[PDB]
Design a protein around this ligand. Sequence first.
Ligand SMILES: CCCCCCCCCCCC
Ligand SMILES: CCCCCCCCCCCC
Ligand SMILES: CCCCCCCCCC
Ligand SMILES: CCCCCCCCCC
Ligand SMILES: CCCCCCCC
Ligand SMILES: CCCCCC
Ligand SMILES: CCCCCC
Ligand SMILES: CCCCCC
Ligand SMILES: CCCCCC
Lengths: 271, 278
Amino acid sequence: GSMAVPPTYADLGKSARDVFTKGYGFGLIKLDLKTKSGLEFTSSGSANTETTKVTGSLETKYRWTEYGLTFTEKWNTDNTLGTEITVEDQLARGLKLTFDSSFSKNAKIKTGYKREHINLGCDMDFPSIRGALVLGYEGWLAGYQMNFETAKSRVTQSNFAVGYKTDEFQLHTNVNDGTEFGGSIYQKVNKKLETAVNLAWTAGNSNTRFGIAAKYQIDPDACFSAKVNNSSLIGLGYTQTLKPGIKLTLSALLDGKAGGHKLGLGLEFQA
Amino acid sequence: GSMAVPPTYADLGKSARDVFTKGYGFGLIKLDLKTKGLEFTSSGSANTETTKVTGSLETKYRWTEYGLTFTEKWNTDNTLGTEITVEDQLARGLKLTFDSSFSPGKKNAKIKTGYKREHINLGCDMDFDIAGPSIRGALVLGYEGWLAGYQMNFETAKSRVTQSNFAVGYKTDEFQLHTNVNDGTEFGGSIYQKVNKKLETAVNLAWTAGNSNTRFGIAAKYQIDPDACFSAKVNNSSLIGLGYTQTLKPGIKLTLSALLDGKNAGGHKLGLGLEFQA
Ligand SMILES: CCCCCCCCCCCC
Ligand SMILES: CCCCCCCCCCCC
Ligand SMILES: CCCCCCCCCC
Ligand SMILES: CCCCCCCCCC
Ligand SMILES: CCCCCCCC
Ligand SMILES: CCCCCC
Ligand SMILES: CCCCCC
Ligand SMILES: CCCCCC
Ligand SMILES: CCCCCC
């Protein structure tokens, strides 16, 4: 983040998360194709490694910009269809509201106002409410979030986050429902290498969990990622854009200490 | 030993270091007077090469009920030093101190915030200096005896990173192997092994990027009796080092040392030390 606008609470510490999460894709062979990116068509076909289950997905996205609207369609192989309507920066400079639906309810309305040093958020779920608030002060970041159930009239979760970040170095911490502590350090050495460190421990248990990850970019269109943790789990991640259109991702998981591993492959056609 | 908590970054490879550093004290005659709640530790040392004399008066008193520790430092030259330490009050593994000192020499203060835990050992340093404030972080992880540590010093005056140090090592009480890289151009390794209760061994390794030559050292500590021990060290720079320490009675220990320039007639050094404990 190089702007004066703080990210959303859910997007807090995304840089370190991208080092651990993205670039791997274990235990799934998925084939995705997005086109006409404008009417945005997106096809997704993922096959499972453990259960050998093949599930498909076809996504359409009508987006026309001047009035700030974006329609969304997503139907999967086993019928479950949802629509998403979102207007951006029309009723106010930093206003944004969405509308959700599903098919066999799960309708949702999500409102969020962003400004310089401030990024509030509120979500209406159909019957719970989730409110979020993130404040930025000279590179620092503080955040709070509360999920409220309307029927029980009781707060479900309460997360409080503090952190400091730049485009080169990020540190974030958060407490989930009071009993869960989590921390993540992200530091990029150069344009070609990225490295993140993860920390988490639950209140009431003395033990903790830590993990390290890497993201090494050899060529502009070929990079490598590797992660590990104290649970004797290893993860390798490879990616090579074969040509501008198609982009291949091969990865593997190794169980350091029965003896079942995981292997992942991914192709990303783009026309 | 092999406690669940990893050590401080600066404390990585302390078992090997102690075989070299402690038990010697060359070229200095020192007299320490430790006294027990509060603690008044009086120190008086005289240099052998320049015949200068310094005497330090230290006052410390801890408060176990609230984890507080007060510490005062003052020497012959009018230099004052103060330190306050709180432990395990705001959190279980939390610890944070505040140092303050000035010398009629410069004046500076710093706050050192460090959180140790099972398998973790976090530590941060907020240092306010005359030149510029300096922020120094340190994280050390432990996985089944393996230790991986990192440390950075950040000169905040104008955004720059002063030193970056990456260190890995496998540590058990019977065998401690450690390696570190400093500033990306300096490498250093230590091999600590204790043969038995009576003998300890350490090996030192060091070489700099851009120079073919290396520097190594071998040390040893042999403890003849419960009240007497012997030390020895030698490096590839032709420097022999001996030391003898004997507890004469419960409250006193005597330390004799000598540094002998092995090859090329150079100035030799001799050390003597007393440690009254009362
Ligand atoms: C923190 C480093 C984790 C390394 C784990 C790799 C798995 C191999 C470990 C074999 C002993 C359990
Ligand atoms: C770096 C953050 C350190 C915060 C300490 C949290 C305390 C964890 C709970 C342990 C029992 C009090
Ligand atoms: C020029 C920006 C005007 C901002 C008004 C929007 C207020 C949203 C209140 C939550
Ligand atoms: C663990 C302490 C976190 C403080 C980070 C220091 C960043 C300030 C640089 C201006
Ligand atoms: C964990 C942060 C250590 C301080 C480094 C600050 C660099 C801006
Ligand atoms: C525009 C078609 C909407 C279908 C959603 C039920
Ligand atoms: C500053 C918020 C931390 C809460 C600890 C229970
Ligand atoms: C507890 C964090 C201290 C860092 C001061 C900037
Ligand atoms: C704590 C050492 C691992 C951090 C990435 C170099």
